[PDB]
Structure 1
Amino acid sequence: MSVLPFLRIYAPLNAVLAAPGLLAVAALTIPDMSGRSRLALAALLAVIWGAYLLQLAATLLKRRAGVVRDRTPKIAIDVLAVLVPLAAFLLDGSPDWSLYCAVWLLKPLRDSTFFPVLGRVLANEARNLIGVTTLFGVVLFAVALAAYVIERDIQPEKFGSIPQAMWWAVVTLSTTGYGDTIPQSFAGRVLAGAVMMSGIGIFGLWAGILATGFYQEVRRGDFVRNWQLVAAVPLFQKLGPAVLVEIVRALRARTVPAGAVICRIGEPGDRMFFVVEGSVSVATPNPVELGPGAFFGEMALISGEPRSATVSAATTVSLLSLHSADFQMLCSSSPEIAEIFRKTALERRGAAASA
Structure 2
Amino acid sequence: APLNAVLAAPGLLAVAALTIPDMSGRSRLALAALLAVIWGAYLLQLAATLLKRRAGVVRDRTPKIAIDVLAVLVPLAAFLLDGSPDWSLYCAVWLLKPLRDSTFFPVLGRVLANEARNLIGVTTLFGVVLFAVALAAYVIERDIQPEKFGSIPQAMWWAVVTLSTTGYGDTIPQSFAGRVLAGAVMMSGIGIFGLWAGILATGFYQEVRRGDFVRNWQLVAAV
Global fold match (TM > 0.5)? yes
Which whole-Å deviations, capped at 9, do the CAs of 1:268-317 have from their partners, x for residues lacking one? xxxxxxxxxxxxxxxxxxxxxxxxxxxxxxxxxxxxxxxxxxxxxxxxxx
Distance 1:125 1:191 in 2: 32
- Flag the 1:230–1:32 CA change in 2: closer, same or farther, 3 A: farther
Distance 1:160 1:56 in 2: 53
- Flag the 1:223–1:15 CA change in 2: closer, same or farther, 3 A: farther
Aligned-partner SS, 1:154 = coil
Shift of the alpha carbon at 1:222? 8.4
Q: Say whether 1:83 aligns with 2:83.
A: no
Shift of the alpha carbon at 1:219? 5.8
- Flag the 1:160–1:110 CA change in 2: closer, same or farther, 3 A: same
Count of aligned pairs = 223
- Flag the 1:87–1:131 CA change in 2: closer, same or farther, 3 A: closer
Which ranges in structure 1 are unaligned for 5 or more consecutive residues?
1-10, 233-354
Shift of the alpha carbon at 1:204? 2.0
Shift of the alpha carbon at 1:225? 9.9
Distance 1:174 1:51 in 2: 41
Shift of the alpha carbon at 1:165? 0.7
Distance 1:57 1:103 in 2: 18
Contact 2:15–2:92, Cα closer than 8 Å, also in 1: no
Distance 1:227 1:98 in 2: 55
Shift of the alpha carbon at 1:77? 1.7
Shift of the alpha carbon at 1:132? 2.1
Percent identity of paired positions between Structure 1 and Structure 2: 100
If you compute each CA radius of gyration, which structure gives the higher value, 1 or 2? 1
Equivalent in the alignment of 1:206:
196
Aligned-partner SS, 1:150 = helix
Shift of the alpha carbon at 1:183? 1.7
Where do 1:1-355 residues align within 5 Å? 11-63=1-53, 65-218=55-208, 220=210
- Flag the 1:221–1:180 CA change in 2: closer, same or farther, 3 A: farther
Contact 2:18–2:31, Cα closer than 8 Å, also in 1: no
Deviates more, 1:78-87 or 1:62-71: 62-71
Distance 2:86 2:205 in 1: 42
Shift of the alpha carbon at 1:228? 12
Contact 2:165–2:189, Cα closer than 8 Å, also in 1: yes
When the two chains are superposed, the root-mean-square deviation of aligned CA atoms in Å is 3.4
Higher helix share: 2
Distance 2:37 2:157 in 1: 44
Aligned-partner SS, 2:147 = helix
Higher strand share: 1
Distance 1:39 1:219 in 2: 54
- Flag the 1:20–1:93 CA change in 2: closer, same or farther, 3 A: same
Shift of the alpha carbon at 1:91? 0.7
Contact 2:138–2:149, Cα closer than 8 Å, also in 1: yes
Deviates more, 1:128-137 or 1:79-88: 128-137
Shift of the alpha carbon at 1:226? 11
Distance 1:225 1:25 in 2: 48
Distance 1:154 1:175 in 2: 24
Distance 2:158 2:120 in 1: 23
Shift of the alpha carbon at 1:223? 8.0
